[PDB]
Amino acid sequence: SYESPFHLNDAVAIVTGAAAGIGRAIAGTFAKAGASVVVTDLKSEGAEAVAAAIRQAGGKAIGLECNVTDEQHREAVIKAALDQFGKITVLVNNAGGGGPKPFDMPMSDFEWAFKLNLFSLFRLSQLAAPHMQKAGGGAILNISSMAGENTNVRMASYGSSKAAVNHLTRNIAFDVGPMGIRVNAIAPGAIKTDTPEIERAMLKHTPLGRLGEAQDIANAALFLCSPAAAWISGQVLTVSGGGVQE
Amino acid sequence: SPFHLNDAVAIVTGAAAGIGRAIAGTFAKAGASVVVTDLKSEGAEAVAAAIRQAGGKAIGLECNVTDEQHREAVIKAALDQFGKITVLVNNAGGGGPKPFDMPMSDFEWAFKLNLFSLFRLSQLAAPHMQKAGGGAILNISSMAGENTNVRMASYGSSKAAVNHLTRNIAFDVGPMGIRVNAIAPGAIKTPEIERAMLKHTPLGRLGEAQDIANAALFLCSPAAAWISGQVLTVSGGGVQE
Amino acid sequence: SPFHLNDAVAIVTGAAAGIGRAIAGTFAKAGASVVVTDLKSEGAEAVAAAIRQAGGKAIGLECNVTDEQHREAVIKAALDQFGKITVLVNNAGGGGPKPFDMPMSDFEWAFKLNLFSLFRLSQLAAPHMQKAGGGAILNISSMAGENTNVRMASYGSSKAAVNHLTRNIAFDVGPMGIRVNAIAPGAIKTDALATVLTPEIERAMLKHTPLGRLGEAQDIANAALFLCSPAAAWISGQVLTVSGGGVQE
Amino acid sequence: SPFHLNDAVAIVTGAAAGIGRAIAGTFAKAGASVVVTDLKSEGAEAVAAAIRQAGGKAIGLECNVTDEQHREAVIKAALDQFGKITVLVNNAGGGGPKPFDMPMSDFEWAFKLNLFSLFRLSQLAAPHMQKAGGGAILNISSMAGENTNVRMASYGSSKAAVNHLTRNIAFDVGPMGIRVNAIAPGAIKTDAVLTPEIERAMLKHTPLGRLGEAQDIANAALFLCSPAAAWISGQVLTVSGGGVQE
């Protein structure tokens, strides 16, 4: 090849929770860099909308419903990718959720964070790995959170499931490296998405003095899933303007 | 000397043998009354008996820490017997090397046993520690929570979640006067292969269970009163592999 | 796309060979006018000439980064050549394994060359980058700044100082519009190493490298291009480890 | 207890006041013959005299830790007075917030004082520790070694160097019978100027709701230099009430 290694020409990319925000920028970006994209979401309307806009833009995409915590949903996506495009070379695990919860929280909540943030993406990684190997190499990207490394009040379930996403990333890179597969994570800072007094106090400890755009994350994501990052694996890259947003 | 647990009540889980037993023994001799727990209660009872024989206050219970009934029984049984809970040592856990393509039940059990169990106990134990004007939680983690290897997907990531849970709940239970810390212990002896195990261990010897109990005592004592949210690696300066 | 250095002026230090040289060539390809620097001026001149012949803009200059007059000379010369400074890559550095009982001068020298030099050049470059409305500084650190081992008192601690300096001065120069990041390369098969490297040493180095290869100079240059481009407009204070997933011990 | 310094000879630098003084007094009480060091000799001997009264053994010497002739004189004074060296607490240090554009002399000085000095004294002590069949080195670092703020170029980066040096020389000196550890103290309420709303601010992210005491650190120092930590080496122990004091 003679194109820059910053493209995904030939690639096939599953992006989860991609109807809005970071996930949506990743889907559009991966497509414009030459990937055929499988957009998934909890609501298929949002997923299909994203896929259609990609198709409109010149790229190749399909849009699907996926509850990443549902086994038959996870397997359906894997099947749909191969049926449509014939291989899987990139997995972006962007689906997740949760937030401040009190210490005394119900035990169904604590277990939910791990079900949602961890178990889903680990399983999705097991499912994709065999196919990426057959394709002769892949990249997995986990969208984690800065809470995975920060410490604060009300963060028992969210902070600890994210810290777990970080370390699974660092360890499975050992498992799947010999299969040709790289595994990294991005910890995004606060993303300005859909009150200019609260903004000045969100950015009190942010050196670059602005909120993120979803496109900042997607740029970092494209680098990390591209051949320009071919020798990078097991890494957690924090994209937050140099500090913490609160 | 603030390195003594005089007037203290400590639950110590998975404490039949190994690290948990040496911590149960040591805290007892440190001045504390000990609710020893274990999967198999003949293991638990034996340790409790040997403490009483040595001249200390203790009781031994069966507890499968992944059982909400077993968990609450331990709390009640601590309270009936000794009148309060002041120290909780989460030593029960398990797992190890497992292939990347393990069954999901294997993966989930790692979290159930190593993480879910100890987070509940902490919740259960906490209000009583507050009611006692303060306390200390101590989690026995693993170096796998910090290190990176092959076959470590479930065991490494769950021990990593335990470390960061420790750092974060220190913020929640801090205002309740509770301190939360963890220990990551190296390879514990509890001749040819031993030289090779020691290849990246600067102190040139394998661990003793007591080494861990010594650090456990410091952290759970008033001499570490302004220590919270920490993960202390006790491994002679390196990794045993 | 956002991966180009259109209109940029980059100083790349210690850049006659290896990682420095791949960064200089790649930044020039990406659109930057490049001031290639090296202890040996003929070496820097050679890379600048290749950049020029490949259809790019570059000069090569002598520079001992530990010499205050060389540093300021370099800064003035980049401004005399191209009118502004928007990118600084602090690739010059050195040192390695040293006994615990090493003379103090060995220990201090690791800081002088690895840390004091790149701190001073960042100071000198910063007000120029602010006048040009934006900058990126990139420090080439090392995995030794994170790992622990025998014979690393001066090399490891000096590189850990680089990593943390990077995290901290990000706070200082972010309000000037400057981003500061570092790369910590693992073992990179340059022609310095590839000559010395035996197949059986290489195998020991691959033992704990999940990707099954040593790195190439271009791996580092690609990472460096990302980190100094618009594609990383919102990344500062980071240390990106490029190590193929593990360690090369 | 295993938390005693019986038969120990401990050198403690910067010990006229604050943390250094408390470590010295505490080490004496735990059985150590203490060599008390300070920039001002009258301060060093004041701590030494006080110790001698309360029932321990301590000499007081003047020492600028950045001066080789001084460093060597403490070493010799300890051997002459007590016959051996088994423990070294490198507590002497300094610096703090500095502007980015600081003169190089200031940047370089943070290293001469916080790092070059403790490394040299470790070099000097180590042979006498080996000849005595073991010892412990304790570096007093700072939370600046790990945290990130404005104005921390010289101070933060020198303390990070201290931390990583501790991790690394643990390897060089462990086969000599020597452990090397560090303490990163938070804000410690020594005799040091602090107002009510300043202190309230520092407590905002301290979970335990109090600043620390010199004795908090001394206790941790005692643990780390005692046989109860005989298998602990290369560690950085943060004593900070569970959070940060900023």
Side-chain angles (χ1 to χ4, degrees), chain A residues 1-2 4-31 33-42 44 46-78 80-133 135-191 193 195-196 198-203 205-245, chain B residues 1-28 30-39 41-44 46-52 54-56 58-75 77-111 113-188 191 194 196-198 200-240, chain C residues 1-39 41 43-56 58-111 113-188 190-194 196-215 217-249, chain D residues 1-28 30-39 41 43-111 113-130 132-188 190-203 205-245:
Chain A
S1 179
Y2 299 96
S4 97
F6 294 102
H7 287 265
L8 305 171
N9 297 309
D10 199 278
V12 178
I14 295 159
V15 197
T16 65
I22 289 165
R24 179 182 46 208
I26 288 168
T29 306
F30 279 29
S36 296
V37 191
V38 173
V39 181
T40 83
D41 203 81
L42 221 226
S44 77
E48 169 50 47
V50 171
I54 285 167
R55 281 189 270 98
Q56 277 191 41
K60 309 173 179 187
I62 65 171
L64 304 164
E65 180 207 344
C66 195
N67 184 315
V68 290
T69 77
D70 183 288
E71 189 63 72
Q72 286 67 51
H73 281 234
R74 287 189 292 255
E75 290 178 22
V77 168
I78 296 298
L82 304 151
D83 290 350
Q84 185 72 19
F85 302 112
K87 60 167 154 84
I88 302 162
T89 69
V90 170
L91 175 66
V92 179
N93 292 307
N94 168 67
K101 253 62 143 35
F103 176 73
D104 60 16
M105 83 180 71
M107 212 80 337
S108 72
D109 286 351
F110 189 86
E111 302 175 40
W112 174 244
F114 284 86
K115 229 295 186 81
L116 214 207
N117 291 319
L118 190 77
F119 300 177
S120 53
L121 60 68
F122 173 72
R123 184 52 180 171
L124 230 26
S125 301
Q126 285 185 315
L127 265 19
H131 301 294
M132 289 173 174
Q133 185 170 31
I140 301 175
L141 208 221
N142 304 322
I143 310 301
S144 188
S145 157
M146 290 184 69
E149 285 169 1
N150 292 331
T151 57
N152 223 325
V153 81
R154 314 229 309 141
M155 215 96 282
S157 56
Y158 191 64
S160 93
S161 53
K162 291 305 189 187
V165 174
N166 288 0
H167 209 56
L168 187 290
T169 305
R170 295 184 192 100
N171 282 100
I172 66 163
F174 273 83
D175 296 318
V176 308
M179 305 175 201
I181 302 168
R182 300 154 30 240
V183 190
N184 302 280
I186 293 176
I191 298 306
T193 178
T195 48
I198 220 90
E199 192 159 318
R200 258 168 293 107
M202 291 194 75
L203 302 168
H205 297 276
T206 304
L208 294 170
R210 65 157 181 103
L211 262 24
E213 308 291 333
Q215 194 58 52
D216 292 314
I217 309 310
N219 287 346
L222 163 72
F223 164 70
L224 278 182
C225 297
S226 82
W231 210 53
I232 309 182
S233 188
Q235 295 321 295
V236 177
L237 174 78
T238 298
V239 181
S240 60
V244 303
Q245 291 82 50
Chain B
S1 166
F3 297 86
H4 299 271
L5 293 171
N6 29 236
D7 226 331
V9 180
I11 304 168
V12 181
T13 68
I19 290 156
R21 185 221 267 156
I23 286 167
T26 294
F27 281 30
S33 3
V34 182
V35 188
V36 182
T37 101
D38 198 82
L39 218 207
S41 60
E42 317 76 73
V47 171
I51 284 162
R52 278 189 256 90
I59 46 164
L61 312 173
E62 181 202 6
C63 184
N64 178 309
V65 288
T66 64
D67 190 302
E68 177 65 28
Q69 285 65 56
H70 281 255
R71 280 192 289 263
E72 295 181 86
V74 162
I75 306 288
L79 295 160
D80 301 338
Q81 207 74 24
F82 300 111
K84 69 178 166 56
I85 297 161
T86 211
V87 177
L88 167 65
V89 186
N90 293 119
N91 173 236
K98 297 192 175 88
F100 176 68
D101 68 13
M102 71 174 83
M104 280 301 303
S105 53
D106 268 356
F107 196 88
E108 297 189 67
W109 176 247
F111 287 79
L113 176 71
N114 293 319
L115 185 70
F116 297 166
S117 60
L118 75 74
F119 170 70
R120 185 53 181 154
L121 274 149
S122 300
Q123 269 179 339
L124 286 170
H128 308 295
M129 284 173 174
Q130 187 180 18
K131 228 128 82 84
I137 307 194
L138 183 75
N139 306 312
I140 309 303
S141 185
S142 174
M143 295 180 59
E146 216 98 284
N147 290 337
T148 54
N149 259 279
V150 82
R151 302 182 82 227
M152 213 52 40
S154 51
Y155 185 70
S157 71
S158 69
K159 295 297 183 166
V162 170
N163 291 353
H164 198 54
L165 185 71
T166 301
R167 294 183 199 105
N168 284 281
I169 70 146
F171 274 84
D172 296 319
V173 309
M176 314 183 191
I178 307 167
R179 301 166 34 241
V180 199
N181 291 296
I183 283 151
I188 300 307
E194 210 195 46
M197 272 197 279
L198 255 15
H200 302 316
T201 304
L203 295 182
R205 76 175 176 79
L206 216 60
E208 286 305 314
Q210 189 58 36
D211 288 334
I212 318 307
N214 284 335
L217 174 59
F218 165 68
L219 290 174
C220 287
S221 83
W226 206 53
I227 305 182
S228 194
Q230 298 321 111
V231 178
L232 185 53
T233 302
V234 187
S235 69
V239 301
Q240 296 74 56
Chain C
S1 303
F3 304 99
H4 288 120
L5 295 180
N6 309 319
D7 284 27
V9 171
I11 301 172
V12 188
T13 62
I19 286 170
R21 185 213 279 141
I23 290 167
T26 309
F27 281 27
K29 306 256 198 276
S33 303
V34 177
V35 179
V36 179
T37 275
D38 194 73
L39 252 186
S41 61
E45 268 142 42
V47 183
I51 286 162
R52 261 181 268 110
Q53 314 315 131
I59 56 160
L61 310 174
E62 175 176 344
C63 186
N64 189 337
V65 298
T66 69
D67 185 306
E68 178 61 22
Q69 296 309 319
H70 285 224
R71 290 191 291 248
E72 295 182 39
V74 158
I75 295 288
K76 233 172 260 96
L79 290 166
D80 292 352
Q81 197 67 29
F82 298 123
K84 70 178 178 183
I85 297 169
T86 65
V87 180
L88 169 66
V89 173
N90 295 119
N91 173 80
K98 301 277 214 298
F100 170 80
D101 75 344
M102 80 186 81
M104 282 305 298
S105 65
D106 281 344
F107 193 94
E108 293 191 44
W109 180 251
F111 291 80
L113 166 66
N114 288 321
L115 181 71
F116 302 168
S117 72
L118 59 71
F119 172 69
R120 181 56 163 145
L121 275 162
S122 303
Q123 279 191 329
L124 288 175
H128 301 110
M129 288 171 162
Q130 183 175 37
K131 314 300 196 201
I137 298 172
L138 171 68
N139 303 314
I140 310 299
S141 187
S142 152
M143 282 194 66
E146 224 78 67
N147 306 141
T148 54
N149 223 310
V150 74
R151 297 179 103 89
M152 286 288 111
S154 63
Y155 192 72
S157 75
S158 86
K159 296 287 183 179
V162 184
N163 286 357
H164 208 47
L165 176 82
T166 296
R167 291 185 199 104
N168 284 276
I169 72 166
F171 279 88
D172 292 328
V173 300
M176 315 172 186
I178 302 158
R179 298 148 35 212
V180 193
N181 303 284
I183 295 160
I188 299 299
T190 69
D191 288 276
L193 178 53
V196 179
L197 181 76
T198 75
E200 128 276 321
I201 281 168
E202 187 170 3
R203 213 197 321 116
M205 287 191 141
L206 292 193
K207 187 169 158 220
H208 295 301
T209 306
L211 296 178
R213 62 169 186 104
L214 264 23
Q218 197 62 47
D219 296 331
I220 304 311
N222 288 339
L225 174 69
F226 167 65
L227 285 176
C228 294
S229 73
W234 205 51
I235 301 170
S236 190
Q238 306 310 107
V239 185
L240 185 52
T241 293
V242 184
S243 64
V247 293
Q248 298 84 46
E249 302 173 352
Chain D
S1 279
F3 307 90
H4 289 270
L5 270 20
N6 302 312
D7 298 300
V9 181
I11 298 169
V12 183
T13 67
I19 292 161
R21 181 209 284 156
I23 286 168
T26 308
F27 276 29
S33 292
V34 183
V35 178
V36 191
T37 271
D38 211 77
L39 234 203
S41 67
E45 199 79 66
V47 178
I51 283 161
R52 263 195 251 87
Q53 258 179 139
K57 305 160 201 194
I59 60 164
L61 319 160
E62 183 224 344
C63 185
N64 184 357
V65 299
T66 73
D67 185 302
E68 174 65 11
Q69 285 71 40
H70 286 208
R71 289 191 293 251
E72 297 182 344
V74 173
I75 291 300
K76 188 173 293 100
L79 293 157
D80 288 350
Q81 186 73 29
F82 303 117
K84 64 179 204 282
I85 298 156
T86 66
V87 174
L88 173 70
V89 186
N90 292 123
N91 176 71
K98 261 55 155 33
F100 175 69
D101 67 347
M102 78 186 85
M104 288 309 300
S105 65
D106 278 4
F107 193 83
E108 292 188 83
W109 175 258
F111 284 85
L113 174 57
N114 293 328
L115 185 63
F116 304 161
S117 68
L118 64 73
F119 174 68
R120 188 45 177 163
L121 274 166
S122 306
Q123 270 183 333
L124 285 177
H128 306 290
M129 286 176 174
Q130 188 183 40
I137 298 174
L138 184 67
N139 299 321
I140 315 294
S141 176
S142 155
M143 290 196 65
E146 203 155 320
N147 295 145
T148 65
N149 230 254
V150 68
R151 301 196 118 240
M152 282 292 108
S154 56
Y155 191 72
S157 84
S158 78
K159 294 301 194 172
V162 171
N163 287 357
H164 205 45
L165 177 88
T166 303
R167 295 178 198 105
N168 285 270
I169 73 164
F171 281 85
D172 294 312
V173 305
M176 300 173 203
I178 303 158
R179 305 136 51 209
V180 193
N181 292 289
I183 290 159
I188 300 310
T190 59
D191 299 341
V193 192
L194 158 86
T195 80
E197 111 284 11
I198 281 188
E199 175 175 339
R200 157 159 36 86
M202 296 186 170
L203 298 189
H205 314 273
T206 309
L208 292 177
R210 60 169 187 93
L211 288 191
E213 274 308 335
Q215 197 58 46
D216 291 308
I217 316 296
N219 286 352
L222 180 65
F223 170 61
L224 288 177
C225 295
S226 85
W231 206 51
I232 305 189
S233 192
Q235 300 306 292
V236 183
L237 171 67
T238 297
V239 187
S240 76
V244 297
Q245 294 83 57

